[PDB]
Design a protein around this ligand. Structure first.
Ligand SMILES: *C(=O)/C=C\c1ccc(O)cc1
Length: 125
């Protein structure tokens, strides 16, 4: 298992070296979105939590297609604000409830070290 803790201050540096394969070894869910919310990476843990088959959600829009619950000021709103500002690092609890048993989670969104990419980390609470 890849030893990286949820909420780590330099997490973006650590994950910049990981391929989709290594991303599946994280102890928490990890999604990489582009500026428009399109899914570039989606690890196994995220699949476990949401029920989605990883390889099938890549290329889909997270806020429009995959996770409509999220599409709100408290989630998507924070995301679009961070994208426009070029800076993003926020942590909050949220309830995942679309076509799934309502699941409470802790979400951490942070701008990737890369150009136009952003991370969304999820773990159960
Ligand atoms: C709300 O929609 C939040 C998360 C989420 C992500 C994927 C799927 O499939 C359901 C729910």
């Amino acid at each position: 298992m890849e030893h990286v803790a949820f909420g780590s201050e330099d997490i973006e540096n650590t994950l910049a070296k990981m391929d989709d394969g290594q991303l599946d070894g994280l102890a928490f869910g990890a999604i990489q979105l582009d500026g428009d919310g399109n899914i570039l990476q989606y690890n196994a843990a995220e699949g476990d939590i949401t029920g989605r088959d990883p390889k099938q959600v890549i290329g889909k829009n997270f806020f429009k297609d995959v996770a409509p619950c999220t599409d709100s000021p408290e989630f998507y709103g924070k995301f679009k604000e961070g994208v426009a500002s070029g800076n993003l690092n926020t942590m909050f609890e949220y309830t995942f409830d679309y076509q799934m048993t309502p699941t409470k989670v802790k979400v951490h969104m942070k701008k990737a070290l890369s150009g136009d990419s952003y991370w969304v980390f999820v773990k159960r609470v």
